């Protein structure tokens with residue numbers, strides 16, 4: 057009845073875990089949102105028990121990551137948790153070690169994307185990938201189960217004998233609030249009289265930001281289109297576009313936004329030229345808003361978008377092919393609407409958050425009384 061949700065970032069708790077956490081709260085359980093201080097901490101803290109901790113999120117310095125995970129073990133023990141749900145690599149691995157050193161009997165892991173350590177292929181990153189996968193063998197062994205939001209990550213980690221099928225649970229996508237993301241009750245943002253080509257993402261190079269911006273240059277307002285980017289940059293980050301880049305192209309930059317349903321309602325299609333995903337939630341949000349998607353033919357994207365059904369797949373690291381798929385849909389409105397309609401139909405029947413949350417709780421029921 058004391059269930060914590062550990063993440064390296066409060067955004068995962070607030071956007072992804074939330075439906076699970078709200079379901080458990082409603083059932084009368086005490087629910088903990090464990091993540092470093094961020095932009096959603098204050099909001100999270102009036103819905104659940106917010107707990108913050110110091111985390112060097114990207115650092116790979118052993119002593120930093122050891123000291124950090126010792127402090128986290130203490131922070132976690134003070135919560136007297138019955139079960140901990142972790143998410144993503146650093147929480148899955150070091151969060152599990154910390155949780156077990158803290159006396160938490162049950163730890164459920166979650167993989168929602170393999171990350172940039174499977175995009176980059178340099179020798180340094182290949183070494184880091186090997187260590188992480190070696191530690192996963194241990195954390196997965198100490199943990200009781202791991203949920204996977206797509207099939208490819210599960211297949212892969214199984215193929216590498218990192219985890220036994222017995223513990224693999226496949227719950228496709230983290231779900232989307234299809235009653236909130238509902239065209240009929242949403243008033244579009246006013247972005248003009250243009251065909252808005254919308255990309256929602258943190259400005260990671262590995263999200264395809266460069267390709268989205270080059271594709272904007274290539275189409276250059278074709279058929280009265282306008283590329284729009286929603287998300288945050290970060291200065292002094294090799295892995296990220298700075299605001300100067302995000303504002304300096306044939307793209308309208310809106311920064312961070314909370315009116316995503318309204319922005320999607322204003323848009324003509326959603327683009328996600330990611331280098332790698334798990335089950336992208338912005339794609340789900342577009343589908344729920346009955347909007348067609350053009351996404352990269354990469355892990356995750358190619359499970360959330362079926363080419364010719366709810367969207368079009370384009371080659372990765374290829375600004376011209378991304379522009380081509382967008383042009384195709386600009387050239388054929390009746391097709392673009394048909395794909396969006398298929399997206400809305402697919403999400404309502406398989407990806408509404410409420411049933412997805414109930415399936416997580418059925419996994420928890422295996423170990424604790426809810």
Ligand SMILES: CC(=O)N[C@H]1[C@@H](OP(=O)(O)OP(=O)(O)OC[C@H]2O[C@@H](n3ccc(=O)[nH]c3=O)[C@H](O)[C@@H]2O)O[C@H](CO)[C@H](O)[C@@H]1O
Nearest residue numbers: 071168169205230286287312313316333334335336337338
């Ligand atoms: C592996 C990877 O690279 N990403 C995965 C990771 O999500 P990411 O961390 O990549 O986030 P995402 O891009 O899937 O989702 C972003 C979330 O933030 C919201 N948002 C974003 C920007 C903004 O200004 N305002 C706003 O509200 C957006 O509506 C969405 O709900 O986990 C997700 C949940 O499973 C998916 O599996 C993604 O594939």
